[PDB]
Structure 1
């Protein structure tokens, strides 16, 4: 897991906004925040 990510819950729409992220690299639909990159 690890998840020591600093972008988790950052409000955006795209994953690119969560550019510096490693875990919460994908901005989720309903949450509209930098969630995990699904993978």
Structure 2
């Protein structure tokens, strides 16, 4: 509801990032959904 629930979710694939509109990349160094920079 307030932006990106998925952001900062523990990731392992880009896929394990259900679908945040924002945070949809896995960062292979803080294995957390973040957005593409």
Q: TM-score, normalised by structure 1?
A: 0.69
Q: Where in structure 2 are there 5+ consecutive unaligned residues?
A: none
Larger helix percent: 1
Q: Give the number of aligned pairs.
A: 36
Taking structure 2 as the reference length, the TM-score comes to: 0.71
Distance of 1:20 and 1:29 partners within structure 2: 18
Structure 1 outlier segments of 4+, above 4 Å: none
Return 5+ residue gaps in structure 1 as ranges: none
User: What is the RMSD computed on CA atoms of the aligned residues?
Assistant: 1.8
